[PDB]
């Protein structure tokens, strides 16, 4: 005769369009990393997905499944290793399928380009290191690791191309970009190398891209900007053009952070985390300010406090930007040139450098 009865099997209370994902590496205890799910409209905690050791994460384009990547060990600190890709239901937040991966999936900080998916959502494109690098391909429908893109050896990160069903690029030690065009079977149909874009030693760029529909902008340690137009058959690279005017140089401003840039495609506005008094070793410093650049005019149009943020993400449809300082998620309105701070979700994570909106 108990009045109440505990029940489970419930779906996320808030609608997808409201959800964002904070990937908590929980570095101090990295074997228990998880993804925290939030309602950006109210900062409410909606749930989570445990990602074991140094897990990475992303949401399926159709916005129905939550793809995660991580490493297990029969005994955690000892025993056979199993690197897998897991497919979780986005609304029930439940495990559904495990996909075997060669024991070399990247193990490091959560940069977006390390765990992405083709534009047509058919394949998941992940990064490998053993330490030799290579890009892995997973057939979502087949639930199997289909291709080991070894031509990407000596390269790093994955920049999907929004204008092609199943193509992506990667930055290489030669300062050029390697394009990989997948065939329907998930294997390398064709490839192409671009001309040098930047100098690996004189002006290294951040792997984090400012992605448009047919072009990607990158910023360098010294405040320069490079580009990769992939509207044509082959990639035409360009740059560099400085983000700094003469006074900005006098104060030594430079870009700093991890997923430190973002692009509001509808306005061509590019966002970057900047910190004055830059020099060797400051490329990962918290953001002292967020700079707003107009890519058409190559000029700064707005600058605001960075609230010690390190990573950001942009939601095109709602014209939003999310900044994260490792533990706090800030919500900005970029419908205007100057960003407008809407709210701060405190303690979204203990140690997170990545945050993403549920697709809409």
């Amino acid at each position: 005769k108990p009045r109440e009865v505990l029940t489970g099997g419930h779906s996320v209370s808030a609608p997808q369009e409201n959800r964002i994902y904070v990937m908590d590496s929980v570095f101090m205890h990295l074997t228990e990393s998880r993804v925290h799910v939030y309602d950006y409209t109210n900062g409410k905690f909606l749930g989570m997905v445990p990602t074991a050791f140094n897990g990475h994460v992303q949401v399926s384009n159709d916005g129905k499944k939550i793809y995660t990547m991580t490493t297990y060990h029969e005994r955690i600190t000892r025993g056979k290793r199993s690197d897998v890709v897991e497919v979780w239901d986005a609304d029930k937040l439940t495990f559904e399928k495990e996909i075997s991966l060669p024991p070399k999936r990247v193990q490091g900080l959560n940069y977006d380009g390390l765990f992405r998916q083709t534009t047509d959502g058919k394949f998941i494109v992940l990064q490998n290191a053993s330490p030799a690098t290579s890009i892995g391909i997973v057939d979502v429908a087949k639930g199997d690791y289909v291709e080991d893109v070894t031509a990407a050896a000596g390269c790093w990160s994955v920049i999907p191309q929004p204008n092609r069903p199943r193509s992506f690029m990667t930055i290489c030690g030669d300062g050029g970009l390697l394009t990989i065009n997948l065939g329907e079977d998930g294997k390398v149909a064709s490839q192409s190398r671009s001309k040098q874009m930047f100098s690996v030693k004189d002006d290294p760029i951040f792997i984090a891209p400012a992605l448009d529909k047919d072009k990607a902008h990158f910023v360098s340690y010294y405040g320069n900007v490079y580009s990769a137009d992939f509207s044509g058959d082959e990639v035409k690279v360009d740059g560099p053009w400085s983000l700094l005017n003469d006074e900005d140089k006098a104060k030594n401003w430079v870009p700093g952070g991890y997923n430190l840039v973002g692009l509001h495609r509808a306005s061509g506005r590019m966002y970057v985390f900047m910190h004055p008094d830059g020099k060797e070793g400051t490329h990962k410093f918290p953001a002292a300010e967020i700079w707003v650049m107009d890519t058409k005019t190559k000029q700064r149009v707005a600058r605001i406090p960075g609230r010690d943020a390190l990573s950001m993400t942009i939601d095109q449809q709602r014209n939003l930007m999310l900044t994260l300082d490792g533990g706090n998620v800030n919500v900005y309105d970029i419908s205007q040139p100057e960003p407008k701070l809407l709210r701060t979700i405190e303690g979204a994570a203990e140690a997170s450098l990545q945050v993403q909106f549920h697709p809409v």
């Binding site: 070399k104 030799a132 050896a153 000596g154 030669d174």
Partner: protein
């Protein structure tokens, strides 16, 4: 005499930091030993000889070559001689003619295996 056994471990190291080729050698042979236990597609090594200021350039072009091309560009003319990349427990050799080393310029030996030339580097010199 005219023989040299250079080693390499899973620790990205060469036990030699510089090799010397006696001047009365018509040809020189260089044998590489990989003491490590890691496979070659992850942490393999090879030896590439090239003019000092050609190292950086050679190492980069070979990286685009791939393990199948032993991480050396095919027909690269900045390369004097190079060995077949090999992982843990393997060994291989290369034998170039010393008349090939020129007048008044220093050479280097490194590993074109993506990112290993940063530390796995030394000097190969002609002399008595």
């Amino acid at each position: 005499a005219c023989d040299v056994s250079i080693e390499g471990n899973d620790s990205m190291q060469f036990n030699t930091k510089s090799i010397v080729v006696d001047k009365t050698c018509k040809e020189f042979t260089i044998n590489l030993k990989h003491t490590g236990k890691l496979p070659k597609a992850a942490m393999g090594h090879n030896v590439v000889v090239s003019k000092k200021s050609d190292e950086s350039a050679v190492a980069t072009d070979g990286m685009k070559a791939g393990l199948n091309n032993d991480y050396v560009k095919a027909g690269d003319e900045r390369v004097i001689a190079h060995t077949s990349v090999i992982g843990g427990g393997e060994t291989d050799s290369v034998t170039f003619d010393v008349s090939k080393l020129k007048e008044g310029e220093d050479y280097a030996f490194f590993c074109s295996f993506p990112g290993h030339w940063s530390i796995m580097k030394g000097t190969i010199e002609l002399g008595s």
